[PDB]
């Protein structure tokens, strides 16, 4: 019959990296997680306790609870035609801080600095990002760069 065990189809997902087996480095256990931090989930195959289910591999959530060796993460899961909130009790070895927003905090700091320096001098602070714009006009010189003519090559075998 069919098999739908807890760790089914996880042959490669939970493997260690090549030449990266063994004990976990100490910086994993020294990081500090607080309620409200954004973390991403990546199960470590050598730690069988506090291991997330395979569905949450590669998912990002928000910490809501902090315990002795584990944290609680909030995950929104799409079930049917709606999203339901899932609460996971995961050990710290299976998570890490998310860099998707640490850079955003830098832009928040930079916006305030540019907002303040323009507060006394210039109107229209212009603190909004823009997408890539079409290129402006330019002049290309041929001094030492005379164009060289190219032609299609004939067919050859060279086997």
């Amino acid at each position: 019959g069919k098999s739908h065990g807890y760790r089914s189809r996880t042959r490669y997902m939970f493997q260690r990296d090549f030449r990266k087996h063994g004990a976990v480095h100490l910086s994993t256990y020294l990081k500090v997680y607080k309620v409200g931090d954004i973390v991403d989930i990546k199960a470590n195959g050598s730690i069988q306790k506090g291991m997330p289910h395979k569905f949450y591999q590669g998912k990002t959530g928000v910490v809501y609870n902090v315990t002795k060796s584990s944290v609680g993460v909030i995950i929104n899961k799409m079930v049917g035609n709606r999203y339901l909130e899932k609460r996971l009790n995961l050990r710290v070895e299976h998570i890490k801080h998310s860099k998707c927003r640490q850079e955003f905090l830098e832009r928040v700091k930079a916006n305030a600095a540019k907002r303040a320096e323009a507060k006394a001098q210039g109107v229209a602070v212009q603190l909004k990002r823009q997408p890539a714009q079409p290129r402006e006009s330019r002049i290309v010189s041929t001094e030492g760069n005379v164009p060289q003519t190219l032609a299609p090559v004939p067919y050859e075998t060279f086997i």
């Binding site: 290309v140 164009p147 060289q148 003519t149 190219l150 299609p152 004939p154 067919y155």
Partner: protein, 171 residues
Amino acid sequence: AHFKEYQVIGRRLPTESVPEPKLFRMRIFASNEVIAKSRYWYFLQKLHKVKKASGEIVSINQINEAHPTKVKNFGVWVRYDSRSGTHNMYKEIRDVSRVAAVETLYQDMAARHRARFRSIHILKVAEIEKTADVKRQYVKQFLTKDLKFPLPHRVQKSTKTFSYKRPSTFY
């Protein structure tokens, strides 16, 4: 369609590490500038590590025939794909302009070899400057001194359904 010849000059996008990238030029036969620029990147991607997203078109200019009222013998080198394999061919076309010779070439390739536009690469078009350098007999026969030939069996065009006389084919 009625082909026109363009020159297209392109370059890689300038970078901080490598400024003033080299300029590359080629002559393209196409119906309009939109097709010509498309063909330029098609051949460039077969020769250099570059594509449209990492390049820029510098200049596109129409090239006119220097002597559009002089009969010339053109030598044409082509590469085309058949139903099984790729082949190189040499053909000779007699006309007054390069664009007219190229249009004849595409018609000839489609008629005799069933080769579409997408399957043909024009390697080189050049004018045979000297007589006795023509090496195809279907072109040499028109180079004879004081060439003359009639047009037997003339067929006239009628604008009416019915005719009141038996037509003649004299000329």
